[PDB]
């Protein structure tokens, strides 16, 4: 106690894969004896589990407000455009958002908050592929199927040799999202939460 | 018949470790066929293959359905994943009976790899995937089992996780590809299969 027991952390699908690899060793450096029971899911589900006590702390994107749950913004994360290496846009330095409504744009299905954020960053012509992760989308743009949008932390977390996929920033103003941690106020281990947060910011 | 997009499904425990090698090889022998990709459970891929919204699926045996051709591609061994501090680090290989422990982390019920691991043995994190399992192992939560194609597919610096082979006889799965018998594009199937076979070849350091 109180840094001596497993901590149950949830995160949304479009954050966990890109955060945990950085998070775990940084957490380890401060916090050698606490392992993480991890779950990745949609926002509302992580919220329900946070409420029922199945999860102790969740990682979501704003907006997010929950009874008896404290919510601290952790950082901001700009979006980037993902494309095949032979795509015309590779000649551009940045991509204006208005260019993005086109059948060639590949989106997550409903339920993903990132989907709505991307849609809001755009000016109805799209391709939605359900039961998809961001990685699956990266694979299909790598095969030359279309083009997509990623959060910053995901752009280089892949195992593709150079010359397969290219990433270009958005033209100003760059759309982004706000990453935040949530935990319940009555949580008997506040120092575990602070360790978690501090470790997240140092990434 | 190699200038149109091909619709491919694969099970959760195969795709993430296959596509990073499959896509380049595929453009290299077939640069005008992009993949529409889906990852899901075996039965869902089966149904999607039968309905025709998928053209081919990549699965593990056993697998046999009427009016569906199935071609075994290769054998992939299993490996044991552990924290870098874990005492099993001292071991060269790990006896399968040692996976009789609550430390052992498994996938949900819908995954065929769960069953395969359970068959190779004497707690379950639900709706999990292998990467999440890797993360929790990396945090020190326990120990797990991976297919070989997944043991290097991570972004942790060395010194965080370690992998050891099973003691002989080593457990394995058989990766295969399935497609409709009267599928109008057999050549694409053959390319895809060969490319998949190539992926099974681990590139030396």
mmCIF file with all atom_site columns, C-alpha atoms in Angstrom, chain A residues 6 13 16-17 20-22 24-25 28 32 34-41 49 127-133 136 139-145 156-161 164, chain B residues 5 12 15-16 19-21 23-24 27 31 33-40 48 85 124-129 132 135-142 152-156 160:
data_model
loop_
_atom_site.group_PDB
_atom_site.id
_atom_site.type_symbol
_atom_site.label_atom_id
_atom_site.label_alt_id
_atom_site.label_comp_id
_atom_site.label_asym_id
_atom_site.label_entity_id
_atom_site.label_seq_id
_atom_site.pdbx_PDB_ins_code
_atom_site.Cartn_x
_atom_site.Cartn_y
_atom_site.Cartn_z
_atom_site.occupancy
_atom_site.B_iso_or_equiv
_atom_site.pdbx_formal_charge
_atom_site.auth_seq_id
_atom_site.auth_comp_id
_atom_site.auth_asym_id
_atom_site.auth_atom_id
_atom_site.pdbx_PDB_model_num
ATOM 1  C CA . UNK A 1 6   ? -2.287  -4.061  -9.435  1.00 0.00 ? 6   UNK A CA 1
ATOM 2  C CA . UNK A 1 13  ? -9.093  1.894   -28.708 1.00 0.00 ? 13  UNK A CA 1
ATOM 3  C CA . UNK A 1 16  ? -3.993  2.465   -25.611 1.00 0.00 ? 16  UNK A CA 1
ATOM 4  C CA . UNK A 1 17  ? -1.877  0.840   -28.365 1.00 0.00 ? 17  UNK A CA 1
ATOM 5  C CA . UNK A 1 20  ? 1.050   1.829   -23.170 1.00 0.00 ? 20  UNK A CA 1
ATOM 6  C CA . UNK A 1 21  ? 4.391   0.993   -24.775 1.00 0.00 ? 21  UNK A CA 1
ATOM 7  C CA . UNK A 1 22  ? 5.732   4.381   -23.644 1.00 0.00 ? 22  UNK A CA 1
ATOM 8  C CA . UNK A 1 24  ? 4.829   0.967   -18.949 1.00 0.00 ? 24  UNK A CA 1
ATOM 9  C CA . UNK A 1 25  ? 8.554   1.580   -18.587 1.00 0.00 ? 25  UNK A CA 1
ATOM 10 C CA . UNK A 1 28  ? 8.121   1.084   -13.954 1.00 0.00 ? 28  UNK A CA 1
ATOM 11 C CA . UNK A 1 32  ? 8.314   -1.002  -9.795  1.00 0.00 ? 32  UNK A CA 1
ATOM 12 C CA . UNK A 1 34  ? 2.525   -1.985  -9.540  1.00 0.00 ? 34  UNK A CA 1
ATOM 13 C CA . UNK A 1 35  ? 1.388   -3.958  -12.574 1.00 0.00 ? 35  UNK A CA 1
ATOM 14 C CA . UNK A 1 36  ? -1.442  -2.836  -14.804 1.00 0.00 ? 36  UNK A CA 1
ATOM 15 C CA . UNK A 1 37  ? -4.590  -4.783  -15.487 1.00 0.00 ? 37  UNK A CA 1
ATOM 16 C CA . UNK A 1 38  ? -5.423  -3.231  -18.838 1.00 0.00 ? 38  UNK A CA 1
ATOM 17 C CA . UNK A 1 39  ? -8.623  -2.995  -20.824 1.00 0.00 ? 39  UNK A CA 1
ATOM 18 C CA . UNK A 1 40  ? -9.259  -1.243  -24.126 1.00 0.00 ? 40  UNK A CA 1
ATOM 19 C CA . UNK A 1 41  ? -12.799 -0.289  -25.111 1.00 0.00 ? 41  UNK A CA 1
ATOM 20 C CA . UNK A 1 49  ? -16.734 0.101   -15.679 1.00 0.00 ? 49  UNK A CA 1
ATOM 21 C CA . UNK A 1 127 ? -15.607 5.150   -46.713 1.00 0.00 ? 127 UNK A CA 1
ATOM 22 C CA . UNK A 1 128 ? -16.497 3.670   -43.350 1.00 0.00 ? 128 UNK A CA 1
ATOM 23 C CA . UNK A 1 129 ? -15.111 0.258   -42.532 1.00 0.00 ? 129 UNK A CA 1
ATOM 24 C CA . UNK A 1 130 ? -16.507 -1.238  -39.347 1.00 0.00 ? 130 UNK A CA 1
ATOM 25 C CA . UNK A 1 131 ? -14.924 -3.616  -36.831 1.00 0.00 ? 131 UNK A CA 1
ATOM 26 C CA . UNK A 1 132 ? -11.728 -1.802  -37.656 1.00 0.00 ? 132 UNK A CA 1
ATOM 27 C CA . UNK A 1 133 ? -8.753  -0.625  -35.652 1.00 0.00 ? 133 UNK A CA 1
ATOM 28 C CA . UNK A 1 136 ? -6.061  -2.290  -39.932 1.00 0.00 ? 136 UNK A CA 1
ATOM 29 C CA . UNK A 1 139 ? -2.534  -1.756  -43.529 1.00 0.00 ? 139 UNK A CA 1
ATOM 30 C CA . UNK A 1 140 ? -5.242  -1.013  -46.034 1.00 0.00 ? 140 UNK A CA 1
ATOM 31 C CA . UNK A 1 141 ? -3.824  2.423   -46.953 1.00 0.00 ? 141 UNK A CA 1
ATOM 32 C CA . UNK A 1 142 ? -0.396  0.702   -47.193 1.00 0.00 ? 142 UNK A CA 1
ATOM 33 C CA . UNK A 1 143 ? -1.858  -1.714  -49.735 1.00 0.00 ? 143 UNK A CA 1
ATOM 34 C CA . UNK A 1 144 ? -2.872  1.357   -51.706 1.00 0.00 ? 144 UNK A CA 1
ATOM 35 C CA . UNK A 1 145 ? -6.608  1.306   -50.965 1.00 0.00 ? 145 UNK A CA 1
ATOM 36 C CA . UNK A 1 156 ? 5.334   6.034   -36.220 1.00 0.00 ? 156 UNK A CA 1
ATOM 37 C CA . UNK A 1 157 ? 4.148   3.044   -34.172 1.00 0.00 ? 157 UNK A CA 1
ATOM 38 C CA . UNK A 1 158 ? 4.227   0.578   -37.055 1.00 0.00 ? 158 UNK A CA 1
ATOM 39 C CA . UNK A 1 159 ? 6.627   -2.007  -38.478 1.00 0.00 ? 159 UNK A CA 1
ATOM 40 C CA . UNK A 1 160 ? 6.760   -0.876  -42.118 1.00 0.00 ? 160 UNK A CA 1
ATOM 41 C CA . UNK A 1 161 ? 10.014  -0.375  -43.966 1.00 0.00 ? 161 UNK A CA 1
ATOM 42 C CA . UNK A 1 164 ? 5.453   2.239   -47.905 1.00 0.00 ? 164 UNK A CA 1
ATOM 43 C CA . UNK B 2 5   ? -9.170  -4.680  -54.902 1.00 0.00 ? 5   UNK B CA 1
ATOM 44 C CA . UNK B 2 12  ? -7.381  -11.387 -34.465 1.00 0.00 ? 12  UNK B CA 1
ATOM 45 C CA . UNK B 2 15  ? -3.563  -10.221 -38.928 1.00 0.00 ? 15  UNK B CA 1
ATOM 46 C CA . UNK B 2 16  ? -1.538  -7.789  -36.798 1.00 0.00 ? 16  UNK B CA 1
ATOM 47 C CA . UNK B 2 19  ? -0.014  -7.734  -42.721 1.00 0.00 ? 19  UNK B CA 1
ATOM 48 C CA . UNK B 2 20  ? 3.179   -5.736  -42.019 1.00 0.00 ? 20  UNK B CA 1
ATOM 49 C CA . UNK B 2 21  ? 5.028   -8.335  -44.166 1.00 0.00 ? 21  UNK B CA 1
ATOM 50 C CA . UNK B 2 23  ? 1.408   -5.855  -47.800 1.00 0.00 ? 23  UNK B CA 1
ATOM 51 C CA . UNK B 2 24  ? 4.928   -5.088  -49.148 1.00 0.00 ? 24  UNK B CA 1
ATOM 52 C CA . UNK B 2 27  ? 2.594   -4.810  -53.797 1.00 0.00 ? 27  UNK B CA 1
ATOM 53 C CA . UNK B 2 31  ? 1.045   -3.635  -57.323 1.00 0.00 ? 31  UNK B CA 1
ATOM 54 C CA . UNK B 2 33  ? -4.357  -5.042  -55.983 1.00 0.00 ? 33  UNK B CA 1
ATOM 55 C CA . UNK B 2 34  ? -5.076  -3.197  -52.770 1.00 0.00 ? 34  UNK B CA 1
ATOM 56 C CA . UNK B 2 35  ? -6.517  -5.056  -49.828 1.00 0.00 ? 35  UNK B CA 1
ATOM 57 C CA . UNK B 2 36  ? -9.771  -4.272  -48.108 1.00 0.00 ? 36  UNK B CA 1
ATOM 58 C CA . UNK B 2 37  ? -9.011  -5.748  -44.716 1.00 0.00 ? 37  UNK B CA 1
ATOM 59 C CA . UNK B 2 38  ? -11.100 -7.086  -41.868 1.00 0.00 ? 38  UNK B CA 1
ATOM 60 C CA . UNK B 2 39  ? -10.102 -8.703  -38.576 1.00 0.00 ? 39  UNK B CA 1
ATOM 61 C CA . UNK B 2 40  ? -12.674 -10.816 -36.699 1.00 0.00 ? 40  UNK B CA 1
ATOM 62 C CA . UNK B 2 48  ? -18.642 -13.162 -44.429 1.00 0.00 ? 48  UNK B CA 1
ATOM 63 C CA . UNK B 2 85  ? 12.634  -9.897  -14.332 1.00 0.00 ? 85  UNK B CA 1
ATOM 64 C CA . UNK B 2 124 ? -8.996  -14.771 -18.682 1.00 0.00 ? 124 UNK B CA 1
ATOM 65 C CA . UNK B 2 125 ? -8.998  -11.088 -19.538 1.00 0.00 ? 125 UNK B CA 1
ATOM 66 C CA . UNK B 2 126 ? -12.196 -10.617 -21.503 1.00 0.00 ? 126 UNK B CA 1
ATOM 67 C CA . UNK B 2 127 ? -12.455 -8.863  -24.870 1.00 0.00 ? 127 UNK B CA 1
ATOM 68 C CA . UNK B 2 128 ? -8.688  -8.596  -24.764 1.00 0.00 ? 128 UNK B CA 1
ATOM 69 C CA . UNK B 2 129 ? -6.250  -8.956  -27.668 1.00 0.00 ? 129 UNK B CA 1
ATOM 70 C CA . UNK B 2 132 ? -3.029  -5.772  -24.434 1.00 0.00 ? 132 UNK B CA 1
ATOM 71 C CA . UNK B 2 135 ? 1.279   -4.715  -22.183 1.00 0.00 ? 135 UNK B CA 1
ATOM 72 C CA . UNK B 2 136 ? 0.035   -6.252  -18.963 1.00 0.00 ? 136 UNK B CA 1
ATOM 73 C CA . UNK B 2 137 ? 2.882   -8.816  -19.043 1.00 0.00 ? 137 UNK B CA 1
ATOM 74 C CA . UNK B 2 138 ? 5.260   -5.924  -19.622 1.00 0.00 ? 138 UNK B CA 1
ATOM 75 C CA . UNK B 2 139 ? 3.877   -4.244  -16.493 1.00 0.00 ? 139 UNK B CA 1
ATOM 76 C CA . UNK B 2 140 ? 4.626   -7.406  -14.494 1.00 0.00 ? 140 UNK B CA 1
ATOM 77 C CA . UNK B 2 141 ? 1.069   -8.693  -14.146 1.00 0.00 ? 141 UNK B CA 1
ATOM 78 C CA . UNK B 2 142 ? 1.793   -12.231 -15.303 1.00 0.00 ? 142 UNK B CA 1
ATOM 79 C CA . UNK B 2 152 ? 9.006   -9.338  -32.155 1.00 0.00 ? 152 UNK B CA 1
ATOM 80 C CA . UNK B 2 153 ? 6.020   -7.213  -33.212 1.00 0.00 ? 153 UNK B CA 1
ATOM 81 C CA . UNK B 2 154 ? 6.200   -4.628  -30.435 1.00 0.00 ? 154 UNK B CA 1
ATOM 82 C CA . UNK B 2 155 ? 7.673   -1.244  -29.614 1.00 0.00 ? 155 UNK B CA 1
ATOM 83 C CA . UNK B 2 156 ? 9.210   -1.936  -26.246 1.00 0.00 ? 156 UNK B CA 1
ATOM 84 C CA . UNK B 2 160 ? 11.142  -5.030  -20.701 1.00 0.00 ? 160 UNK B CA 1
#
